[PDB]
Design a protein around this ligand. Structure first.
Ligand SMILES: [Mg+2]
Ligand SMILES: [Mg+2]
Ligand SMILES: [Mg+2]
Ligand SMILES: [Mg+2]
Ligand SMILES: [Mg+2]
Ligand SMILES: [Mg+2]
Ligand SMILES: [Mg+2]
Ligand SMILES: [Mg+2]
Ligand SMILES: [Mg+2]
Ligand SMILES: [Mg+2]
Ligand SMILES: [Mg+2]
Ligand SMILES: [Mg+2]
Ligand SMILES: [Mg+2]
Ligand SMILES: [Mg+2]
Ligand SMILES: [Mg+2]
Ligand SMILES: [Mg+2]
Ligand SMILES: [Mg+2]
Ligand SMILES: [Mg+2]
Ligand SMILES: [Mg+2]
Ligand SMILES: [Mg+2]
Ligand SMILES: [Mg+2]
Ligand SMILES: [Mg+2]
Ligand SMILES: [Mg+2]
Ligand SMILES: [Mg+2]
Ligand SMILES: [Mg+2]
Ligand SMILES: [Mg+2]
Ligand SMILES: [Mg+2]
Ligand SMILES: [Mg+2]
Ligand SMILES: [Mg+2]
Ligand SMILES: [Mg+2]
Ligand SMILES: [Mg+2]
Ligand SMILES: [Mg+2]
Ligand SMILES: [Mg+2]
Ligand SMILES: [Mg+2]
Ligand SMILES: [Mg+2]
Ligand SMILES: [Mg+2]
Ligand SMILES: [Mg+2]
Ligand SMILES: [Mg+2]
Ligand SMILES: [Mg+2]
Ligand SMILES: [Mg+2]
Ligand SMILES: [Mg+2]
Ligand SMILES: [Mg+2]
Ligand SMILES: [Mg+2]
Ligand SMILES: [Mg+2]
Ligand SMILES: [Mg+2]
Ligand SMILES: [Mg+2]
Ligand SMILES: [Mg+2]
Ligand SMILES: [Mg+2]
Ligand SMILES: [Mg+2]
Ligand SMILES: [Mg+2]
Ligand SMILES: [Mg+2]
Ligand SMILES: [Mg+2]
Ligand SMILES: [Mg+2]
Ligand SMILES: [Mg+2]
Ligand SMILES: [Mg+2]
Ligand SMILES: [Mg+2]
Ligand SMILES: [Mg+2]
Ligand SMILES: [Mg+2]
Ligand SMILES: [Mg+2]
Ligand SMILES: [Mg+2]
Ligand SMILES: [Mg+2]
Ligand SMILES: [Mg+2]
Ligand SMILES: [Mg+2]
Ligand SMILES: [Mg+2]
Ligand SMILES: [Mg+2]
Ligand SMILES: [Mg+2]
Ligand SMILES: [Mg+2]
Ligand SMILES: [Mg+2]
Ligand SMILES: [Mg+2]
Ligand SMILES: [Mg+2]
Ligand SMILES: [Mg+2]
Ligand SMILES: [Mg+2]
Ligand SMILES: [Mg+2]
Ligand SMILES: [Mg+2]
Ligand SMILES: [Mg+2]
Ligand SMILES: [Mg+2]
Ligand SMILES: [Mg+2]
Ligand SMILES: [Mg+2]
Ligand SMILES: [Mg+2]
Ligand SMILES: [Mg+2]
Ligand SMILES: [Mg+2]
Ligand SMILES: [Mg+2]
Ligand SMILES: [Mg+2]
Ligand SMILES: [Mg+2]
Ligand SMILES: [Mg+2]
Ligand SMILES: [Mg+2]
Ligand SMILES: [Mg+2]
Ligand SMILES: [Mg+2]
Ligand SMILES: [Mg+2]
Ligand SMILES: [Mg+2]
Ligand SMILES: [Mg+2]
Ligand SMILES: [Mg+2]
Ligand SMILES: [Mg+2]
Ligand SMILES: [Mg+2]
Ligand SMILES: [Mg+2]
Ligand SMILES: [Mg+2]
Ligand SMILES: [Mg+2]
Ligand SMILES: [Mg+2]
Ligand SMILES: [Mg+2]
Ligand SMILES: [Mg+2]
Ligand SMILES: [Mg+2]
Ligand SMILES: [Mg+2]
Ligand SMILES: [Mg+2]
Ligand SMILES: [Mg+2]
Ligand SMILES: [Mg+2]
Ligand SMILES: [Mg+2]
Ligand SMILES: [Mg+2]
Ligand SMILES: [Mg+2]
Ligand SMILES: [Mg+2]
Ligand SMILES: [Mg+2]
Ligand SMILES: [Mg+2]
Ligand SMILES: [Mg+2]
Ligand SMILES: [Mg+2]
Ligand SMILES: [Mg+2]
Ligand SMILES: [Mg+2]
Ligand SMILES: [Mg+2]
Ligand SMILES: [Mg+2]
Ligand SMILES: [Mg+2]
Ligand SMILES: [Mg+2]
Ligand SMILES: [Mg+2]
Ligand SMILES: [Mg+2]
Ligand SMILES: [Mg+2]
Ligand SMILES: [Mg+2]
Ligand SMILES: [Mg+2]
Ligand SMILES: [Mg+2]
Ligand SMILES: [Mg+2]
Ligand SMILES: [Mg+2]
Ligand SMILES: [Zn+2]
Lengths: 83, 124, 138, 99, 99, 208
RNA sequence: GGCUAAUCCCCCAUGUGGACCCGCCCCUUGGGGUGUGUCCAAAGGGCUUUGCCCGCUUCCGGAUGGGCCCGCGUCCCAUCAGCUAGUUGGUGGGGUAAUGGCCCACCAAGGCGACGACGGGUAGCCGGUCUGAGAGGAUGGCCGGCCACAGGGGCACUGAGACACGGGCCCCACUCCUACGGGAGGCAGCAGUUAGGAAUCUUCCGCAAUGGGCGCAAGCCUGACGGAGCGACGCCGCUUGGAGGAAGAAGCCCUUCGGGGUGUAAACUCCUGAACCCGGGACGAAACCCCCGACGAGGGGACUGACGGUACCGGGGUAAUAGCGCCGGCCAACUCCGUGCCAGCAGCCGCGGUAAUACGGAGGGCGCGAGCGUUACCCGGAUUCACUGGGCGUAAAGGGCGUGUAGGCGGCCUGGGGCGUCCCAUGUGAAAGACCACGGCUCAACCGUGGGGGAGCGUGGGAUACGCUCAGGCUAGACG
């Protein structure tokens, strides 16, 4: 099932997440279909989250499933906003 | 040679033979002594050199030079082979490492103790 | 049969200039004529003309030299110090436009044959085309 | 693109199959000379349309047998028997070089 | 010890039998029709054929078959039946096949 | 850790004055006065003609020992400089001079390079308002180098600073003596430094 | 042997639709449409039960994932020269999701090989990595991609998917249980033991984070993972003090006995304040959930730590580890004493048989410095396998000579083609790495964000000088 989630790209004690589209079947840090974002939890930068919504909306159109955290970030960036 | 000849045949890479079958690729090898002898040097020099025949963990049997001044090595003592030859002795390709296993570091030696395996003397 | 008539032209020229001849005849073809046109334009020779020898067409290349010299060996400097083939039959060489050589930091030329015709190295870069790399001359 | 190759037919001896010799040339990766190698392809000739010494196009296809992955697209040129003669003779030279 | 994926194996066994049986029946039936076709019995071979087909599709319903396997087997049957059917064929039933 | 031992010895081996000792490398105490010859028993003996290697080596030794830097750091910094766009020698010098403790020496918070290293190390130095305790910090132009508020009352700090009154500072810097501040405005060029060193000899040294 | 439930199995029904044979249309390999005929569906559960939720069934499409096929590229030995029986093709068939000698029957007699078949030897391959001015050489640990294997060999079942590491049947070896009949096993999972070896870690903490499985959820599992532990194994940062201090204490070293050295080095003066003690103390963490709204959007709004009282901030606070190689040339650093072909050094040249700057200590010196040396291996140098970039009269190297097969190479002029060749456009060249820029941990190592680069191959378009090709001339080569 094609999915949308976080992969861990940072260092020890320095987490940096790369929001990706990939088959759930594949491992976490290995090959992904597309990189739609990045996430910084320690918020060390004025930009700690980015999305490229239109893309995320595509991947939802064809049925990718976000993990709850992934979805949280997506909504924060407003993939889901309507009116 | 013509280029056509280089296509047809081409240059030949040059193989090199290992000066140390400690086999294994190993940097050192443990063995047991057999003979602990004295040996006569090759023509240009004169001396009494201390060498030892060794049966290795590699199923190889070779003479190895005993460096330093004094040596406690005996018939059945177990020892570590180093590698590197002695230019003036026929057929000895490897060295003993002092301070390892039964090989004792050189007593009283104050100068270069890394080689020869002696530890640091205390001074007050 | 000359096995590489272009190389033969270059050489005829080399041997000629080395004994300081005023001129040399090389058996003629449009391609050789193109090469020559480039040398002439580039200052290496005084230019060339077509001739007939026993009815068979040739090209007189007129040779250019420096002035006479001081001390032992008054023989003048060469205008073509160096001339050599690059692509030969039996190993052919082609540069793309980004592989075209800077010859003696540019005091020399490289003659390329291209589908825009026979040009110098600068000429080709400016034209923006690659091709068969013929002579190197400086 | 399904791959199309051009070659000459050096063997008709099979049933509904032809052997097609296909040359290719290319620069040697070090020495840079242009070298010309070749290889035989087994191509499917259902109607026995094609004959020895025919220069034909060969197209990558759904596998016919083991060793047959290609079929004969069309006839480029008829009757080059010199090419055939070359192949036949190179193979004839094998009778030396042995014992 | 005693991993209870053990259970899986157990079920695998049950399933195994249920498949074999089902599949077995099909073979036995198909042959029947086919043989009856060689003897040019129109009606009977037809009716057996219908049963075989139905049972094939019913094998397809579950994990026994389905895929394209059922369509393959069914096709092969029907072909061979209709083909076998000509020696004075006159396929009176005509139920199973497009006329 | 760095070289710890008699310094004016190295003043003596290079045959030139490189003051890591600050004051008294001014007064006629430097021992370069009346003992310019190198250390050891053979120092007063004659001098054999130096090999090309020797020349290059020693010149590098001057350049390094001046800044009091680890050969490790030194060479890593050198390769760093060689990578950079622009002339290797000048670039190098710029990077050496860009070192924090060095800037502190330049700004005059310490009479010596080593003392400045200490000042950095113990937290007495701040950059852009924030403490920096590592002397290997690189000052980018526009940074402010201050004696941190807490230690601004320190005996030695005010001692130096009160001596710094009226003295001119480096042209790629600025200094406010009543404020203890200072600003690293630009990277120093070849000519900006009086360095008794031919850098090309050093480049050539790392060429092999 | 007996009882019994279901989202377990089976039989009719409905045929949206689909499968299949035959016909027709389009399309062109088995793609799509259509008509008749035959054949095929389902399952229920939970709530507030007049409605919603979790499910089930047939179909079309999407998405992701894979199967199979082709061009090209991918080590050494020719003292491996011939290899081949399902072997090469065909017809028909079996098998599969699907092409296929994948398998079987019958038919033909083929298929491959110096452009290196067959044989033997070594070997997972790649992104990349090391080295190199480059071309190249070498390598493929960790991280990512692919493959293969799960004690050895064979085999299938179940399933969307396996011929399945912690599933099954059989054979062999091994260990263990054994009432001697017969059974049980499978760390190349995380730790740990044992052996082998020069040598390679903790039988730790936690599911707080990310991810995965099941579940409506609450939640459960997770030795994936996130951390901590040990080892200078590697990289980076840091300390062992700073300033003053004799024309220079003592000891040790040399001495031309005048004195030179160790050396501002020490003592000592003054200053800072590693460790350490005290106090505050994290980010990593807002979702899942709850409430409003329609279980949507939106709005709000509370719970949730292994690391750990760790990082860090604030206060206080002591002058507080130095080692190792070398000093004849290459090569930076020299002198006494001791030993006299000894004892020993040694990478090569070569030192030592009484003045040893080469052995052994000492003083001094150079080099690096929490390291420094050694051994092994790779590239380097080595233009010493020479593509870049070498040679063969006497240094190693012209085959004893010819004829000529394959092959390599090809005069002048015109034209067609446009295969090589060149240009443009476009696709591809994952990420990581590399390069550039900016930024995040006080710096860096490390990390993030962005930019640029790129050989090669696919497709479309274009150029025609050279190479090729086809056609037509020529006569300077060749022959007559
Ligand atoms: Mg997968
Ligand atoms: Mg993107
Ligand atoms: Mg939407
Ligand atoms: Mg023309
Ligand atoms: Mg003219
Ligand atoms: Mg060349
Ligand atoms: Mg035929
Ligand atoms: Mg076939
Ligand atoms: Mg034969
Ligand atoms: Mg179960
Ligand atoms: Mg039966
Ligand atoms: Mg029915
Ligand atoms: Mg079929
Ligand atoms: Mg530079
Ligand atoms: Mg530049
Ligand atoms: Mg300035
Ligand atoms: Mg270099
Ligand atoms: Mg029963
Ligand atoms: Mg029972
Ligand atoms: Mg009942
Ligand atoms: Mg059912
Ligand atoms: Mg029904
Ligand atoms: Mg219908
Ligand atoms: Mg149809
Ligand atoms: Mg119908
Ligand atoms: Mg029912
Ligand atoms: Mg589908
Ligand atoms: Mg595919
Ligand atoms: Mg290999
Ligand atoms: Mg032999
Ligand atoms: Mg057989
Ligand atoms: Mg057969
Ligand atoms: Mg037949
Ligand atoms: Mg078949
Ligand atoms: Mg299957
Ligand atoms: Mg071939
Ligand atoms: Mg390999
Ligand atoms: Mg292997
Ligand atoms: Mg590189
Ligand atoms: Mg490099
Ligand atoms: Mg390379
Ligand atoms: Mg490689
Ligand atoms: Mg390789
Ligand atoms: Mg691997
Ligand atoms: Mg890997
Ligand atoms: Mg793959
Ligand atoms: Mg196996
Ligand atoms: Mg095992
Ligand atoms: Mg075994
Ligand atoms: Mg097995
Ligand atoms: Mg399943
Ligand atoms: Mg199945
Ligand atoms: Mg198994
Ligand atoms: Mg397997
Ligand atoms: Mg296991
Ligand atoms: Mg069992
Ligand atoms: Mg052990
Ligand atoms: Mg052991
Ligand atoms: Mg570990
Ligand atoms: Mg635990
Ligand atoms: Mg968890
Ligand atoms: Mg979770
Ligand atoms: Mg779920
Ligand atoms: Mg509930
Ligand atoms: Mg458990
Ligand atoms: Mg871990
Ligand atoms: Mg240790
Ligand atoms: Mg160690
Ligand atoms: Mg001091
Ligand atoms: Mg004294
Ligand atoms: Mg004295
Ligand atoms: Mg104090
Ligand atoms: Mg938090
Ligand atoms: Mg928070
Ligand atoms: Mg919240
Ligand atoms: Mg409500
Ligand atoms: Mg909301
Ligand atoms: Mg909310
Ligand atoms: Mg939770
Ligand atoms: Mg805690
Ligand atoms: Mg503090
Ligand atoms: Mg304080
Ligand atoms: Mg002290
Ligand atoms: Mg020297
Ligand atoms: Mg020595
Ligand atoms: Mg004596
Ligand atoms: Mg003496
Ligand atoms: Mg002597
Ligand atoms: Mg000596
Ligand atoms: Mg020496
Ligand atoms: Mg010595
Ligand atoms: Mg010393
Ligand atoms: Mg360090
Ligand atoms: Mg080391
Ligand atoms: Mg080498
Ligand atoms: Mg080389
Ligand atoms: Mg080189
Ligand atoms: Mg060599
Ligand atoms: Mg060459
Ligand atoms: Mg090349
Ligand atoms: Mg030579
Ligand atoms: Mg001779
Ligand atoms: Mg000779
Ligand atoms: Mg001869
Ligand atoms: Mg001869
Ligand atoms: Mg010929
Ligand atoms: Mg020509
Ligand atoms: Mg073209
Ligand atoms: Mg045209
Ligand atoms: Mg491109
Ligand atoms: Mg990239
Ligand atoms: Mg990385
Ligand atoms: Mg990086
Ligand atoms: Mg940076
Ligand atoms: Mg920064
Ligand atoms: Mg980066
Ligand atoms: Mg990047
Ligand atoms: Mg890019
Ligand atoms: Mg193209
Ligand atoms: Mg094209
Ligand atoms: Mg044209
Ligand atoms: Mg033309
Ligand atoms: Mg032509
Ligand atoms: Mg030709
Ligand atoms: Mg003609
Ligand atoms: Mg005539
Ligand atoms: Mg004649
Ligand atoms: Zn000084």
């Amino acid at each position: 099932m094609v999915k949308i989630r976080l992969a861990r790209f940072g260092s020890k004690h320095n987490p940096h997440y790369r929001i990706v589209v990939t088959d759930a079947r594949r491992k976490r840090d290995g090959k992904y279909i597309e990189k739609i974002g990045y996430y910084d939890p320690r918020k060390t930068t004025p930009d700690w989250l980015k999305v490229d919504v239109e893309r995320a909306r595509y991947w939802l159109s064809v049925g990718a499933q976000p993990t709850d955290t992934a979805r949280r970030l997506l909504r924060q960036a407003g993939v889901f906003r309507q009116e | 040679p013509t280029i056509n000849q280089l296509v047809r045949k081409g240059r030949e890479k040059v193989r090199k033979k290992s000066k140390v079958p400690a086999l294994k690729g190993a940097p050192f090898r443990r063995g047991v002594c057999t003979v602990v002898r004295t040996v006569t040097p090759k023509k240009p020099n004169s001396a009494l050199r201390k060498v030892a025949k060794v049966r290795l963990t590699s199923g190889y049997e070779v003479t190895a030079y005993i460096p330093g001044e004094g040596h406690n090595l005996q018939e059945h003592s177990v020892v570590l082979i180093r590698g590197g030859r002695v230019k003036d002795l026929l057929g000895v390709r490897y060295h003993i490492v002092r301070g390892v296993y039964d090989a004792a570091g050189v007593k009283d030696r104050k100068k270069s103790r890394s080689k020869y395996g002696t530890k640091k003397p205390k001074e007050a | 049969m000359l096995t590489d008539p272009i190389a033969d032209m270059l050489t005829r020229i080399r041997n000629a200039t080395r004994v300081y001849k005023e001129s040399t005849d090389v058996p003629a073809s449009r391609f050789k004529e193109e090469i020559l046109r480039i040398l002439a334009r580039e200052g290496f020779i005084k230019g060339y003309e077509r001739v007939d020898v026993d009815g068979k067409p040739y090209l007189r290349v007129y040779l250019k030299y420096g002035p006479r010299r001081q001390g032992p060996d008054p023989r003048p400097e060469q205008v073509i110090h160096h001339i050599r083939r690059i692509s030969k039959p039996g190993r052919r060489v082609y540069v793309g436009v980004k592989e075209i050589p800077r010859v003696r930091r540019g005091l020399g030329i490289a003659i390329l044959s291209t589908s825009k015709g026979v040009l110098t190295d600068r000429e080709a870069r400016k034209l923006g085309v690659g091709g068969e790399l013929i002579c190197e001359v400086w | 693109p399904k791959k199309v190759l051009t070659g000459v037919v050096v063997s008709d001896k099979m049933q509904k199959t032809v052997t097609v010799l296909v040359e290719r040339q290319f620069p040697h990766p070090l020495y840079g000379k242009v070298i010309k190698r070749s290889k035989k392809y087994l191509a499917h000739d259902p109607e026995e349309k094609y004959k020895l010494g025919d220069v034909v196009e060969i197209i990558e296809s759904r596998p016919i047998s083991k060793r047959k992955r290609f079929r004969v697209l069309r006839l480029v040129e008829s009757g080059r028997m010199d090419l055939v003669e070359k192949y036949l003779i190179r193979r004839q030279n094998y009778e030396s070089l042995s014992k | 010890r005693n991993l209870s994926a053990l259970k899986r194996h157990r079920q695998s066994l049950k399933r195994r039998l249920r498949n074999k049986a089902k599949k077995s029946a099909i073979k036995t039936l198909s042959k029947k029709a086919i043989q009856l076709a060689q003897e040019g019995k129109a009606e009977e071979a037809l009716k057996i054929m219908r049963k075989a087909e139905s049972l094939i599709d019913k094998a397809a319903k579950g994990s026994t078959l389905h895929k394209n396997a059922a369509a393959r087997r069914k096709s092969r049957l029907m072909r061979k039946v209709r083909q076998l059917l000509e020696a004075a064929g006159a396929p009176l039933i005509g139920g199973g096949l497009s006329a | 850790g760095r070289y710890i031992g008699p310094v004016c010895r190295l003043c003596r081996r290079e045959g030139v004055k490189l003051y890591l000792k600050g004051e008294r490398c001014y007064s006629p105490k430097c021992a370069m006065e009346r003992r310019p010859y190198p250390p050891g028993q053979h120092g007063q003996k004659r001098a054999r003609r130096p090999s090309d290697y020797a020349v290059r080596l020693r010149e590098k030794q001057k350049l390094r020992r001046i800044y009091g830097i680890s050969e490790r750091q030194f060479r890593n910094l050198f390769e760093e400089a060689s990578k950079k766009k622009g002339v290797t020698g000048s670039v190098f010098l710029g990077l050496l001079e860009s070192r924090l403790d060095n800037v502190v020496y330049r700004l005059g918070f310490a009479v010596s390079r080593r003392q400045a290293r200490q000042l950095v190390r113990h937290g007495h130095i701040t950059v852009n308002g924030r403490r920096v305790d590592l002397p290997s910090y690189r000052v980018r132009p526009g940074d402010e180098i201050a004696v941190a508020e807490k230690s601004r009352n320190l005996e030695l700090i005010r001692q130096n600073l009160e001596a710094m009154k009226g003295r001119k500072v480096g042209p790629w810097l600025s200094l406010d003596v009543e404020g203890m501040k200072g600003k690293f405005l630009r990277l120093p060029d070849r000519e900006d430094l009086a360095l008794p060193v031919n850098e090309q000899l050093v480049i050539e040294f790392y060429s092999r």
